Symmetry: C5
Subunit: 118 residues, 5 copies
């Protein structure tokens, strides 16, 4: 199976964004975080972030930000692939999330979104 | 004829998108994939991907991604040029596709799309 | 708490935007500034800027600019994190403010915007 | 006159777009090409292209691509400046065009588009 | 005052746009130019341009271009800051403009635009 693709939430919408600059662990960073909803259904797995110079995958900062902004605009249904327990700066984790954003795929129906499933 | 332009599907719409980050073969990659339909019906040649650091043509990652996102937004009729049997990571090809995305051109009628045909 | 995240204004709208190029302190700069409203409420904390080659955080100029431009388009409610007393160029500070823009987050309700809320 | 601004078509609309990656003449390239509307015909005429690593002007690939995509989206009237007899890869010329895209300007009326004119 | 911010036109709309490539002085350049109107009126100062590798401020080509395109799309009211007598190739000036685009700011009402204004009637 694809490494780091085992943990996802499907058929969600990106209903909030954050983008900022921040000194973390003595380094200058950019970060963004997405906030999720699932229609009217309460979702607790509701925030995932990406940092330009930290994380399991530093690549794709701008492209992932632009992709997240796109789905915030459309309100379309997506699947979010993420990794738990990544961010080690405790101030950041408490403010935003511990989760790293890995991938965003679209859902064309209540069952199907692109990408691997477990 | 133009090398790598002999294999295409016409009058399709990009009805799904994936963008992600992924370690493949020891390298840190970005990828995106496009999902297709043929008007009202499915097409089983229905996914094609591009990878920033692997493939026959590594250039144009951002421009191809932006172009794919554009036609996902418009739902316009397009022709997709692609190359067979490119992606060799078995987990990636199982989840997404073996095909490398080469070009996207528009169709201005049910019988005409820009670019070369066989 | 997150350094430089203790000062913010919530549930505002970006109702004006400036982008330009400018020589400041002997250096060629780009800058942008956002202007804020909060409905019809009188606000005084109403402008914040980012400069490509000066500031506490020089990274993220383009991304912050495009983010600011997006919310100017939507008119949606946002929270603005900023830092006081950054820009020293007297002409620039007089035209805009001294404040450096640190982050922009969205507000999905009257009571929620993303990001930390703890203060000093 | 401005060099490479002598040849143009005015008050046209872009009705097709192509973007791809392609090996030409031993080099990896990106290209895009625009097609122009002719009456109610589906088939475009007067296609023009730009290539990232070849041409008289290699700069501005991404900006020109995004400009062309913009006017394809709006369908607005534009003036297109181009150069004839540029692309020499026979396969590319046959599939797309020999013309290199130089500039795109808007037309605010049937009688005015920005940029220089020739008589 | 802010250097290069003393000449501007306020409450205009960007109603035309040009982008192109051009060889000048042995350098390959990009440029763009904006055309302006003041509501239903034509104005005197109605065009200004930016060039990626010439001018008083070479930085910010892409960000200025994107910003100009945005306001051409929205048709919103803006203030344009510009500098006179920058482009001194007469065939470019005849074709497009002699003025260099310095900044674009918004006008949220007919009475307010963001950005510096001159000190007084004589710009002392
Ligand atoms: O074989 C390949 C491998 O690259 N490409 C050909 C491609 C594929 O065989 C199909 O897309 C697979 O479903 O088919 C091409 O020709 C198509 C195309 O012209 C489409 C346009 O809508 O029509 C397909 O014909 C339809 C037909 O019009 C329908 O009436 C009905 O008969 O079903 C067929 C199948 O959909 C043509 O087959 C293509 O360009 O997509 C040629 C490619 O060389
Ligand atoms: O205001 C602008 C807008 O572009 N630019 C000015 C720039 C910024 O205000 C700062 O870089 C933001 O952090 O400040 C310039 O001036 C500086 C510079 O002269 C340095 C020299 O070391 O001093 C900075 O002032 C120091 C001060 O001397 C110390 O006492 C210190 O502890 O406080 C300040 C910084 O807070 C001056 O601000 C610059 O060149 O960087 C001028 C720019 O025009
Ligand atoms: O399939 C993918 C997707 O990124 N990448 C594979 C990659 C591509 O399939 C190949 O490079 C494309 O030509 O092949 C590898 O053998 C390699 O070049 O190291 C392994 C790598 O995992
Ligand atoms: O036609 C194309 C399309 O990229 N490129 C050709 C390229 C262009 O036509 C030429 O560079 C345009 O000025 O000419 C070549 O002779 C070359 O410069 O090596 C061959 C190359 O295949």
């Amino acid at each position: 199976a694809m490494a780091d693709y085992d943990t996802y939430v499907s058929n969600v919408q990106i209903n909030n964004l954050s983008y900022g600059v921040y000194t973390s662990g003595g380094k200058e960073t950019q970060f963004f975080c997405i906030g999720l909803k699932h229609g009217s259904e309460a979702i607790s797995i509701n925030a995932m972030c990406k940092v330009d110079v930290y994380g399991n995958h530093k690549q794709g900062f701008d492209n992932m930000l632009n992709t997240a902004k796109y789905y915030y605009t459309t309100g379309g249904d997506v699947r979010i692939y993420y990794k738990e327990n990544v961010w080690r700066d405790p101030d950041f984790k408490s403010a935003f999330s511990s989760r790293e954003l890995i991938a965003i795929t679209t859902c064309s129906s209540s069952s199907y979104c692109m990408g691997p499933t477990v």
